[PDB]
């Protein structure tokens, strides 16, 4: 559970926003890509795993689950690649609420940025610092340090 | 000291590798860019500060220190922007040694990757996981969790 992440893909302005959620904290990383391909997904996971100790990734759809390029990055980075079936239906609801919250923040910042990728990084920043009380950024560090100790 | 980072710029294969070092742990993030500009620097810092609690950044040279774009990102993200003068001459030597270590790792992985940007992320992953026995990934989480508590 300190090591479990969920991928999530959402669309805006004709482009794709790929998000990884650390399940136990609500903390996120995200990027803007022109389209979701196994190569883009695999590179994003390699970046994520070099920065946090990623043990398991629930993929966002069957295409990235199937993709041999995604599986080769997970092999390289020591990640267990799993499906994203919401056996717990609460997962579905949490992800959709998170997407709407991100789109809301992106909309509140959109006119401060020329490029969508700046607005998305502004939205990552505000989401991870938001105190709900601790922030998601605080929670992920606490959860992982507790587990290292 | 949990909030202090140092930027560092090194070159390889005709391109630029921008690195942020978390000073107290040795942990790093890095990206490949075609040239170091104020806009590329500012975007890299906005990404970094959405992911870790960045209080201070020592810029890597006087052009990024000067750059009004870099200053605007530091303002947006709540980062105190500082110069990079090594009043402690040990700073120069630690950085030069880290660049030579990264380039050595990049050369050991270089033929597993078509693009330099993959070889660089593979070197970030190996640097941050390497046990010296704690890794730099372990040390940054512990330092920051201690400070949160």
């Amino acid at each position: 559970s300190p090591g479990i992440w969920q991928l999530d893909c959402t669309h805006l302005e004709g482009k794709v926003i790929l998000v990884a959620v650390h399940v136990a904290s609500g903390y996120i990383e995200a990027e803007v890509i022109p389209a979701e391909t196994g190569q883009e997904t695999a590179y994003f996971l390699l970046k994520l795993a070099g920065r946090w100790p990623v043990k398991t990734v629930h993929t966002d759809n069957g295409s990235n689950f199937t993709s041999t390029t995604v599986k080769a990055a997970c092999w390289w980075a020591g990640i267990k690649q799993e499906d994203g079936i919401p056996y717990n239906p609460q997962s579905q609801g949490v992800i959709e609420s998170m997407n709407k919250e991100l789109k809301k923040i992106i909309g509140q910042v959109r006119d401060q940025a020329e490029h969508l990728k700046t607005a998305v990084q502004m939205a990552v920043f505000i989401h991870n610092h938001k105190r709900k009380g601790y922030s998601a950024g605080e929670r992920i560090v606490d959860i992982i340090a507790t587990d290292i100790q | 000291s949990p909030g202090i980072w140092q930027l560092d710029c090194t070159h390889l294969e005709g391109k630029v590798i921008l690195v942020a070092v978390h000073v107290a742990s040795g942990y790093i993030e890095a990206e490949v860019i075609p040239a170091e500009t104020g806009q590329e620097t500012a975007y890299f810092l906005l990404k970094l500060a959405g992911r870790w609690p960045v209080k201070t950044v020592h810029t890597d040279n006087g052009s990024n220190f000067t750059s009004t774009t870099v200053k605007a990102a530091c303002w947006w993200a709540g980062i105190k922007q500082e110069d990079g003068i090594p009043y402690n001459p040990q700073s120069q030597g630690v950085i030069e040694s880290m660049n030579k270590e990264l380039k050595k790792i990049i050369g050991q992985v270089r033929d597993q990757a078509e693009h330099l940007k993959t070889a660089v992320q593979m070197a970030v992953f190996i640097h941050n996981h390497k046990r010296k026995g704690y890794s730099a990934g372990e040390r940054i989480v512990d330092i920051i969790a201690t400070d949160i508590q």
């Binding site: 080769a72 | 990757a113 078509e114 693009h115």
Partner: peptide, 8 residues
């Protein structure tokens, strides 16, 4: 090509 990022 037998690269992680280009398996072809």
């Amino acid at each position: 090509s037998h690269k992680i990022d280009n398996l072809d």
